[PDB]
Design a protein around this ligand. Structure first.
Ligand SMILES: *[C@@H]1O[C@H](CO)[C@@H](O[C@@H]2O[C@H](CO)[C@@H](O)[C@H](O)[C@H]2NC(C)=O)[C@H](O)[C@H]1NC(C)=O
Ligand SMILES: *[C@@H]1O[C@H](CO)[C@@H](O)[C@H](O)[C@H]1NC(C)=O
Ligand SMILES: *[C@@H]1O[C@H](CO)[C@@H](O)[C@H](O)[C@H]1NC(C)=O
Ligand SMILES: N[C@@H](CCC(=O)O)C(=O)O
Lengths: 66, 66, 143
C-alpha cells in the first residue's frame, strides 16, 4: 500500500517470478491492474536468480512467499 | 511410509509453478508448469511449495495446508 | 517469556522443581485431546486445573491463581489485544504449536463442500478476509 508501489516508476522497480501464485494474485485484482502492468516488464525466471539480482542491486524489491 | 506406496520423483520441465495462459495460435487458455503436468497426466501428485488459491482449486485438488 | 516452548521441561515435568506449576486449560476441546494424545504427563497434571469460562481463566491469571493458560491461538491473540495489563503470549509471535485452522463443518460426502471451498478461497484472494481481520480482531497493544 505504499505510494511508491501504487505509483510505479523507474525509481523503484519491483518484480516477481513468472507463472507463479503472485502473478495470478495480481492479475486477478482489479484494484491492482497497474501493479501487474509494471510487474510484467521485469519478471524473473526463478526465485533464486531474482534474489541474486536483488542482492547485487539489480532489482529493488522482490515480492515472494514469506 | 504412512500410506504404503512407492514413488518416483522428478523435477518440473520449465522451472515454473504454473498459471493457465492462452496457448499460441489459438484462443483458449492452457496450463503450464507443475500445474500443466499434473492436469495432463505426466505427474500424479505435486509435492512442492504450491500456494493454495481459487484459480488452481478449480482444476486441482488441494490437501490440508502443511 | 519464562517458559519459551510448549515442550519445555517445566510442562513435560511438572515436578522438576518449585511447587507444582499452576497451568491449566478448558476441557472438552481440541487442545485437551491434543495434550492427552501427545503429552501424557501434561494431561495428567492439567486435570487438577480444570478451568472454565475462558474469561474466568483470564481473570484468575490476572489475580495470580494461575501462571500459564494453554488455549487456542486465535482467541488468545484477541484476548491479549484487548487487555488493560497487556498480557503476553510466551514467544513474540506465540510460536503457534500444532498449527491448524478454523473450518466450516459439513456432513460427510456432501455437495456444498466444493462450492463453499471455492467461495472461501475467493474471499481470501480478494482481501475481504483481511478486512474482516482488521474490523473484528484488532487489538489495542498488539502493535
Ligand atoms: C503395503 O503394500 C504391499 C504391496 O501392495 C503389501 O505387500 C503385500 O502383502 C500381502 C499380504 O499383506 C501379500 O499377500 C503380498 O504378496 C505382498 N506384496 C508384495 C509385493 O510384497 C504390504 O502388506 C502392504 N503393507 C501393509 C498392508 O501394511
Ligand atoms: C505463434 O503465434 C504467432 C501469432 O501471434 C504466429 O505468428 C506464430 O507462427 C505461432 N507459432 C507457432 C509455433 O505456431
Ligand atoms: C467437560 O466434560 C465433562 C464431562 O462430560 C463435564 O463434566 C464438564 O462440565 C465439561 N466442561 C465444560 C462443559 O466446560
Ligand atoms: N476451537 C477449539 C475450542 C477451544 C479449545 O477447546 O481448544 C475447538 O473447537 O476444539
Amino acid at each position: 500500500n505504499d505510494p511508491r508501489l501504487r505509483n510505479p516508476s523507474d525509481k523503484f522497480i519491483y518484480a516477481t517470478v513468472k507463472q507463479s501464485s503472485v502473478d495470478i494474485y495480481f492479475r486477478r485484482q482489479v484494484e491492482l491492474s497497474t501493479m501487474y502492468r509494471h510487474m510484467e516488464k521485469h519478471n524473473y525466471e526463478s526465485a533464486a536468480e531474482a534474489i541474486q539480482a536483488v542482492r547485487d542491486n539489480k532489482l529493488h524489491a522482490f515480492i515472494w512467499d514469506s | 511410509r504412512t500410506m504404503n506406496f512407492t514413488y518416483e520423483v522428478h523435477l518440473v520441465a520449465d522451472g515454473k509453478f504454473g498459471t493457465q495462459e492462452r496457448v499460441n495460435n489459438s484462443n483458449k487458455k492452457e496450463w503450464n508448469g507443475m500445474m500443466g503436468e499434473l492436469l495432463s497426466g505426466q505427474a500424479d501428485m505435486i509435492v512442492a511449495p504450491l500456494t493454495i488459491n481459487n484459480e488452481r482449486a478449480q482444476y486441482i485438488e488441494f490437501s490440508k495446508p502443511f | 517469556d519464562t517458559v519459551s516452548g510448549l515442550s519445555d521441561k517445566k510442562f513435560q515435568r511438572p515436578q522438576d522443581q518449585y511447587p507444582p506449576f499452576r497451568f491449566g486449560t478448558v476441557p472438552n476441546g481440541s487442545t485437551e485431546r491434543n495434550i492427552r494424545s501427545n503429552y501424557r504427563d501434561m494431561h495428567t497434571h492439567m486435570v487438577k486445573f480444570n478451568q472454565r469460562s475462558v474469561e474466568d481463566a483470564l481473570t484468575s491469571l490476572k489475580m495470580g491463581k494461575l501462571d500459564a493458560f494453554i488455549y487456542d491461538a486465535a482467541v488468545l491473540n484477541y484476548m491479549a489485544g484487548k487487555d488493560e495489563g497487556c498480557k503476553l503470549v510466551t514467544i513474540g509471535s506465540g510460536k503457534v504449536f500444532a498449527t491448524t485452522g478454523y473450518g466450516i463443518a459439513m456432513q460427510k460426502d456432501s455437495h456444498w463442500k466444493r462450492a463453499i471451498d471455492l467461495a472461501l478461497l475467493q474471499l481470501l484472494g480478494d482481501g475481504e478476509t483481511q478486512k474482516l481481520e482488521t474490523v473484528w480482531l484488532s487489538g489495542i497493544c498488539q502493535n
